[PDB]
């Protein structure tokens, strides 16, 4: 049984200090043979979820807490320290509110702050550590003011009677032992308990210098600056029980209370299971409302899939069943709410202006998702599996990985705030980390080096994303050279290896939106800027999800927004000619116009397929169906080619080899529908499941369990299932001895297998673009160019590509020009004026209001003299003059520039 437990500890999430990350701290506490650990960061619970995930895995009990800067009228302007532990969940939601109250209140340079009297209402379930020499009671003792001491203790004697402990710390800092003595006395005289703490900020004592620089970078000081605050001692590392016991041997009850307190603290953070909000229904069980909509959804989907042409009545069965099997699993696991929430949201986005990304996770395998128009692929057709997305044989959180554009966030939030409540909705925090370049940069400044000396090392660091220091040393031979040649450079880099990855701040921008069933502060604390605005959950995208809140991420995918513009343009065309608006989901997936094109390798602007190596793969492959469109992203990899698996796929398809299920030597003829569209090769994860379904007789639930069993790659569990495969073979009935011979291959073929529900989701959008480029190239290309206005080169290039595919693209004309590119009545592309760098949407809107205010622009003068000046700057006019927008009307550019002076004289009169 334990002698001591650390109740005051900081991680990098404190941001103003801390060095080690959450999990490592957990692992050190573990190695030290300790029962529990309390990470108490500065005014946040940012790593709380990670903390729990780690304590679970390491067999350590997490203790929730946080340090606070405090102010009470009693000490005036001066701030004091206070550590607050959550004994139970009543106190953990109080601690959350405190943190949220500090930030929501706004702050200045001292950071967020709490009023000690806030501890009056936010009280139950909390255990306070005095703060030590820096606490309100602590300072008074050193100041020697007895009345003050009595008056502070009177607050804790009243509001935290058995929950206030005098914190004793021996880190060899000024006025420590002095306070300790004074505190110990007060303790004995007032009957107050003490407790020992090491005020930990780093793991090993030798991490002290790395921490000092970590702080300095934040404090904006140079390391050797005399006026640089020196607030930490090397003793503030994570000490052992022994070290801590010998250290406080003269006051055991201080050590004993760490163990008592640790016992009194037990907070529950339920991870891995949703807390869904309530979907509008009326009088109907959320379960019931799902089926009414799912069935109505399947009605439409079936009418379309199988037109009145009542062949549907012969294939309708296979669907009605699937819907039920799913709908039952969904309703048993308490997820109908989720499916509805996403359904409705996706609908709202279609009606309003919001485009949502292609990512549906594994959801494309849900026939219910199909019915609710959450996914637009029919999973029956393409053997997309429901129990790969949501398997009742395991615990999981159904995620459609739905994301929208960060630009349209305020619009999205407004809608979910209407649907589920204003303070029920919130944005998600994002953290800044010191990457290789930036850490070299900042450690350089702190060690007193000019930006020139340092940038010479930062420039060696490759720009590749996810680049680490260790990789830079591998790729760039100059680094180890200069590292061993210069003692200063090597001290710089040694230190930057220690700080690499550390967290410096919050965004910047949020990661997305989250929706709680009640006010957000019930599930997470808030973070705010200096003025208590721009609130976000202190948990980030991953953590907030695991805490069991429904989230929607942001993304900068320009592909989906392009397709909107195309259809917009395309449908305006439909408006004049009196024909039905186009539903992009209703397009045929078998279209030779599109596929003949695909094979020509004309994929520029075709989402995903438009790289270089892909176009080589395409030529070599020659896909004629949507099936091998899905296979495309799965074949384009180092794994498949390194094994020749791709060279096989193409060879079979094209007759250079005869199909086999899967192998020439080992195979069976009952895998017909399973390995047919893949031409016999084991490509997708769903196929690994399906062979085990028909060959063995797995229930797809167990098939899914096996798929993962292989990924765990520990024989025990594989041997368990192995036998399950052999007897499974003979029951439904086949030849064994091959079930074992094919198994050890699918064992390996599942290795580089690919999630099909994920591929088809994206592949659909690739095809949707390929199609638009084939049947409406003008509208689509115009849309693509509207998406690239900000980049001139891309525009020029796209113009070439237009002319090459036989499109007529007209240069900037001030009379017909719009902000976005568009298509004229004759099917020609009109240059979007927004493409002219330095003009902007403002002036362009003005130019149009002017033009719609008559006809207009018989010449430059007619524009200048017309359009409101300063809505249209003279410099904005040069940009226009120089784009050749007036080339039709008056004289040409050079001659017009000279005339500009005059036209603006006349302009105002
Ligand atoms: Zn600190
Ligand atoms: Zn602290």
Numbering used by the authors: 3 to 911
What does the primary publication say about this deposited structure?
The DNA polymerases at the core of every bacterial replisome belong to the C-family of DNA polymerases. All members of this family contain a set of four domains that are organised within a single polypeptide in the following order: Polymerase and Histidinol Phosphatase (PHP), Palm, Thumb and Fingers. In E. coli DNA polymerase III, however, the PHP domain has lost several metal-coordinating residues and is likely to be catalytically inactive.
The 3mPHP structure is virtually identical to that of the wild-type protein, with a root square mean deviation of 0.92 Å over 756 aligned Cα atoms. The positions of the two metal ions in the 3mPHP structure are essentially identical to the metal positions in other PHP domain structures, including T. aquaticus Pol III. A third metal ion often found in canonical PHP domains is not observed. In contrast, wild-type E. coli Pol III shows only a very low level of exonuclease activity. Here too, we find that the protein apparently unfolds in a single step, with the 3mPHP mutant being less stable than the wild-type protein.
